[PDB]
């Protein structure tokens, strides 16, 4: 139908401002078709 | 110009404590401006994009949060990206931010896209940080080279003919998408008019149509203006940035418009998460949040 939809809430990537971007606290949830 | 070496260096602080600077040579940064400017000019000022892609709001020189967003979204070219503007000013590392984004533009010119925000403007970033940063780390000559690059940025994008993307918002002058295409580049941002509004205007639930904007520039617009605009052009969603939103994204007018802001803990002054809008090939839009502890 080619139309905008919105998915459910996704768990966010939780980060510590003092940790390297390499070291996230929690991996945020990925979107799935 | 070794684009690969430039990208490798900017990405070297992915495993480093925040605060570490990447200082490219002045000639390499000039090369990043000149070649990206060339690519911006060669591509339409109103981008016609295809999903899937992830859409990002203001970064504002917060470079390590940009890397954290790529850590979540996927580093180029694992995902396609559209940024809505405001790469410089306010943050501590506008130089590393814009150089990585311009390098990514040169590297994947058909998979990485950057719109113009109101801070990609000489009058604005002169006073809000980027000019001072160019001046102490390099020189004023480099800042002027950036201005000639920013003057060539595109100002809007439409994804799958259904999502209208710009930094600020609508304009009372925007009657035909042709009007955006006729805008010639390089150009500065005027104090009024079509191009000004697209970088500067804001939605407002308390305005009926078009109203005063207390930024001293442009307008505010109401939910009815949004709905009339989407029906007239057969679009489903307006995607803009330009304002701090606590949850990193915020809807307006029964989800007909969404505001994205992608710099968490903005300036160390606000309590906000950062968000991207991930759009799959079916145009199902999800918000990936970058949330601080
Ligand atoms: Na179009």
Residue numbers in the entry:
A (entry chain C): 503 to 535
B (entry chain A): 7 to 299
From the manuscript:
While PP1 exhibits broad specificity, it acts in a highly specific manner by forming stable complexes, known as holoenzymes, with a host of regulatory proteins that direct PP1 activity towards specific substrates and localize PP1 to specific regions of the cell. During mitotic exit, PP1, in particular PP1γ (PP1 isoforms include PP1α, PP1β, PP1γ and PP1γ2; ≥ 85% identity between isoforms), is essential for histone dephosphorylation, nuclear-envelope reassembly and chromatin remodeling. These PP1γ-specific processes are mediated largely by the Ki-67:PP1γ and RepoMan:PP1γ holoenzymes. Ki-67 (3256 aa) and RepoMan (1023 aa) bind PP1γ to form isoform-specific holoenzymes.
The Ki-67/RepoMan residues C-terminal to the canonical RVxF motif are not present in any other PP1 regulator whose holoenzyme structure is known, suggesting these regulators bind PP1 using a novel mechanism. To identify this mechanism, we determined the crystal structures of the Ki-67496-536:PP1γ7–308 and RepoMan383-423:PP1γ7–308 holoenzymes complexes to 2.0 Å and 1.3 Å, respectively. As predicted by the ITC and NMR studies, Ki-67 and RepoMan bind PP1 using an identical mechanism. PP1γ is in grey and Ki-67496-536 is in pink with the 2Fo–Fc electron density map contoured at 1σ (2.0 Å); no electron density was observed for Ki-67 residues 496–503 (pink dotted line) and 536. Namely, Ki-67 and RepoMan form a classical β-hairpin on the top of PP1 that extends from the PP1 RVxF binding pocket towards the PP1 N-terminus and then back again (~2600 Å of buried surface area). Ki-67 residues 503–516 and RepoMan residues 390–403 bind the PP1 RVxF and ΦΦ binding pockets (cyan surface; the Ki-67 and RepoMan RVxF and ΦΦ SLiM residues are labeled and in italics). Ki-67 residues 517–535 and RepoMan residues 404–422 bind the newly defined KiR-SLiM binding pocket (beige surface). Residues F517Ki-67/F404RM and P523Ki-67/A410RM are anchored to PP1γ via two hydrophobic pockets while multiple residues in Ki-67/RepoMan bind the side chains of R74PP1, Y78PP1 and Q294PP1 via polar and salt bridge interactions. This orders PP1γ L1, a loop that is generally more dynamic in most free PP1 and PP1 holoenzyme structures as evidenced by its higher B-factors and less well-defined electron density. Using in vitro phosphorylation assays coupled with NMR spectroscopy and mass spectrometry, we showed that both S507Ki-67 and T394RM are phosphorylated directly by Aurora B kinase. Furthermore, mutating S507Ki-67 and T394RM to a phosphorylation mimetic (Ki-67496-536S507D/RepoMan348-450T394D) profoundly weakens their interactions with PP1 (~25-30-fold reduction in affinity).
